[PDB]
């Protein structure tokens, strides 16, 4: 199917406690593969997935070079933002950045990204055309004019259509056995009376990859959208994901309920019934 690469970065200023903390992480699909932490002893980009260890130290030298450069830029961006918003040096502020690309199943470029948030809200983002910028406020308009005049977009487009796509295809091949794997959900049901006349049916999906999944409860084929308690999909910590969905039913009308599980790793959707 399609695939994606994303580098995430956060800078958090800490006025009295020295210079801003910088943390970057890289992902292929739902799999982390690199990290860099400015407060870490190493001062290097480190591997976090088996398939990236085989890169030679020139990759690593260049990657920690690029990521160290990024932390300095974002440190200066935090200061420029203090001016633009006329904020005091007393406060802690956050600058986040994401960039990366999507490719189709043939490995062709679909989409590029390059965007920033300041204090948790959109600042400036490159549009899907990879030529224009979306400025979220007056402060960002200034940056936009600055980057428009400097033709920043063209450089990013070159990175995103070129280097970023090649990297993705490479990682997807080198790490074919884990990245192009599909682990279907291991499913089961639990069941607990909550009174003389009602019971909870809970439908579980465990050990699946990638994270995308849909759990749905029906009563006699009717979707129970508004009456389904659902948790956010969560990492099990071994690279796979978990989710459950529950409904409150009258006892013993349990047989009227069906839980439906859809996931890319299943030949056909599963139906579970107590």
């Amino acid at each position: 199917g399609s695939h994606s690469m994303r580098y995430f970065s956060t800078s958090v200023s800490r006025p009295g406690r020295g210079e801003p903390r910088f943390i970057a992480v890289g992902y292929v699909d739902d799999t982390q593969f690199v990290r860099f932490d400015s407060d870490a002893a190493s001062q290097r980009m480190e591997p976090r997935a088996p398939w990236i260890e085989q890169e030679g130290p020139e990759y690593w030298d260049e990657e920690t070079g690029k990521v160290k450069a990024h932390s300095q830029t974002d440190r200066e961006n935090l200061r420029i933002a203090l001016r633009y918003y006329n904020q005091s040096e007393a406060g802690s502020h956050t600058l986040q950045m994401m960039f990366g690309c999507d490719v189709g199943s043939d490995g062709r470029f679909l989409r590029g990204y390059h965007q920033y948030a300041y204090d948790g809200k959109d600042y400036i983002a490159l549009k899907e055309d990879l030529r224009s910028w979306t400025a979220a406020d007056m402060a960002a308009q200034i940056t936009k004019r600055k980057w428009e005049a400097a033709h920043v977009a063209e450089q990013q487009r070159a990175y995103l259509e070129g280097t970023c796509v090649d990297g993705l295809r490479r990682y997807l091949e080198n790490g074919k056995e884990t990245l192009q794997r599909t682990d279907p959900p291991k499913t089961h049901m639990t069941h607990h009376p909550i009174s003389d006349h009602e019971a909870t049916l809970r439908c579980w999906a465990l050990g699946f990859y990638p994270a995308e999944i849909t759990l749905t409860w029906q009563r006699d084929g009717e979707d129970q959208t508004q009456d389904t308690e659902l948790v956010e999909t969560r990492p099990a910590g071994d690279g796979t994901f978990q989710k459950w969905a529950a409904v409150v039913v009258p006892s013993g009308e349990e047989q009227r309920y069906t839980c439906h599980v859809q996931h890319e790793g299943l030949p056909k959707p599963l139906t579970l019934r107590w």
Binding site: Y7, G26, M45, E63, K66, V67, H70, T73, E76, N77, I80, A81, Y84, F99, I142, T143, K146, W147, A150, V152, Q156, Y159, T163, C164, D166, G167
Partner: peptide
């Protein structure tokens, strides 16, 4: 593979 101010 990894990748002017405000």
């Amino acid at each position: 593979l990894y990748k002017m101010t405000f």
